[model samples]
Target: STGSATTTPIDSLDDAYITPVQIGTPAQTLNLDFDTGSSDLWVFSSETTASEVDGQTIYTPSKSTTAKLLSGATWSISYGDGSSSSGDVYTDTVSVGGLTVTGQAVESAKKVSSSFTEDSTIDGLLGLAFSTLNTVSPTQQKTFFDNAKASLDSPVFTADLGYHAPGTYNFGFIDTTAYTGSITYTAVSTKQGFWEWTSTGYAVGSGTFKSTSIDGIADTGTTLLYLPATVVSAYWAQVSGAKSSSSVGGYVFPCSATLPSFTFGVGSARIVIPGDYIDFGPISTGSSSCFGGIQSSAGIGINIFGDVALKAAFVVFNGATTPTLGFASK
Candidate 1:
């Protein structure tokens, strides 16, 4: 399918990447974007009061028959980009994919940032990128995974990426339908919401980058796509007629030179990013510094794919299986 949702897994609600949730009355089904960068389910709203919660979709659990609101629960999350939001905690009967998980922990923010209050695309984020990197922590209510743990038949989750294809990333329960029975899972040194990862290989254009291997982490929480310093410079150097323009932050190239098709080899599998992704990115600073395919962040804590990397592949997060990561063609 050209535009369809892929399935993955949930470890804890705090770390679950993808889950099926019912929002508002009559419950509109959403293939939500779970992020750890900031903690808030920022959906577009019509009745949002302040600039924080304004223009954002507020999840109306009262309208849902399967959801229950947690009374008096409060939460707020912030990002490295200097954005933050706060809200009350609520509970509801929720499910990930088709798994009917009840008593799931949910957050309802009263105050939000301009980024959230201004968007009109989604209902909210699940914020499952990291375990401890959240602002809204419901008291004792398990994340989607903690609630669904009893139903899981395995102990692993997988995220698959296809560098040049339409169907790239996917998440959900690790079934034989998606994976081919084995994967080269890399162990991450997990600490808080930000973690690190190492690539076995990543290919760009015609050359398979072997010396370009770097350690980073997989983050759905972040909005802007980022990479390391050397990685960013090296990637751009290979672009044809790509030049730094002072009109922008001088980080992005002005010409629309053909961006080489690239993919990341995670263990033995490769996660690909579509060519168009390298064309445009978030505008940073005063320079023409747009978000390149890979970015250079000095002393920055983590390496992230953000939405740019996600749109490229059907990534599967299978914390229910072994420490395995997989990739498939969508």
Candidate 2:
């Protein structure tokens, strides 16, 4: 069956988005980060290291009759940002929106990194990326989307994200009213287990659109847009007093400077990110230095189009045997 779920930005800068997920018997609900960047549906749980739950919600398998331990199964996931988590596995009845999946693999956390313990707003993460990225040992697990695909009216999901506002994630159906104009479809390669594709070109402010292909992935879990240093430097060059600072982390500039809009091409369609979206926020308390929402992907090895760009469009993840990515204007 098809379903729709509302997800909200977790903070003022829209650092991350969270959606409520119902798991196990009687439906214990927890707000989770639905990440499209990685594959591992992990959570804080009763078995978490220290046995002392932090400020986040924890999923207790012992309390749910429907929860069954997947013996010897374990999962470990890490990010380039240094945050990580590892856990044992359990199979439980999991529900999102109104759709139910009886045998969903729910990773029960045994250990979490310092950053995860500090960021209490997110209880867990539900990955919507290809199951090929799943980290389960011995036997890999199918993602909720893959297991539910046969029952779905269509093998697709749409992410209509909003900036500092609630957005909707739809499974098996695309809401016609959520976007304007027609959707622009592009070939997607799940070879690397990411929704990877090449961007045709990009434009900065009113400047010329450079016809350069940039290979990248659409990562919902990431908070900012990271492109090649060449493009990043070009964009920041347009802003007065913008500099690549090691002190403030990456790029920073005067918060009061006139900003420019950034645009990227997907096939023949162009997605534009407003200047306001590029200004992350004040670098410090009441400081005039501001961090940029766009950064260089130099050392990262992979270009990522994060929430900064995704929020500007309606995106569809087609989970066909032959996959594709679709985008539309908001």
Candidate 3:
């Protein structure tokens, strides 16, 4: 059966969008970050040390009759933001948007990094990346979407991330009403366990689009858009007060500075990110200093089109044999 769920924005546009998910027999609800960059279904659990638990909800496997321990299996994950978690494994029933996946490998966290412990709202992460990226030991695991794909009407899921608003994630079918214009399709290379693709070119503001083949991933887990250092510098050149600050981190500008539109070329289509999204809130409370959402991916290895870029359009993660990305203006 097809399934759909609402994604709510937390903090602001640069934070993350979370969706409600049910885990275990009686289905204890949890707000999970549906991430396309990683491939492990992990959660805060009773196994976590009390000192590190903080205010986050933990999954109590003992409370569920269907929970089964996978002897010797363990998982460890680290994110680009320096957040991390390690856990043992359990086979349990997991449900997302009413779609159930039985015997799904659930990583129950026993340890978490400071970043995770600080964010109490996030109960866990539901990875939408390829099954190959699953971190479970002994044998890798499949994601909920991978396990539920055969039963779906079509192997497709759409991400409708919004700018400071609620959006929807649709499975098995596309909602024509959710987007405008034609959906532009681009082939994705999943060799690296991500929805990786290369953009034909990009442009700053109203300037002509430049042809720079930059390879990157469409990561829902990431908050900001990251590109090459040279490209990022070029964009900042057009802004009067924009400068890279060592203390502030990344590029910062005066809130009053007029920003220009940014656009990415997908095949023959143009995906434009409005100037408003470039200003990623203030550096501090009641300050005129603003941090830029577009930053350099110098050390990250791969560029990322995070929520800052994804929210600018409707995106489709097509799970066909040769997986592709479909984009359209929202």
Q: After superposition, how far is residue 292 of candidate 2 from its true place, in Å?
A: 0.3
The residue-by-residue lDDT of candidate 2 on 1-330, one tens digit each, is 997899999999989999999999978888898888888889889899863357988899999999999999999999868899998999999888997888999999999998888887898999999999999997899888888888899999888878889999889998989999999989988988999988999999998899899999988889999999999999999999999998777999899987899999999889999998888889988999999999999989999999999999999999988989999988
Pairs of colliding residues, candidate 3: none
| Ranking, TM-score, top scorer first | 2, 3, 1
Q: Encode model 1's per-residue lDDT on 202-300: one tens digit a residue.
A: 666667655456666666655335777666666778876465544644356644356766677677666666556666544544544344545655547
| Cα lDDT of model 3 by residue, 25-67, tens digit | 8988888999999999999999998888878888999999999
* lDDT minimum window of 10 residues, candidate 2: 49-58
TM-score of 1: 0.73
How many clashes in each candidate? Answer: 62, 0, 0
- Relative to the true structure, candidate 2 has a C-alpha RMSD (angstroms) of 1.1
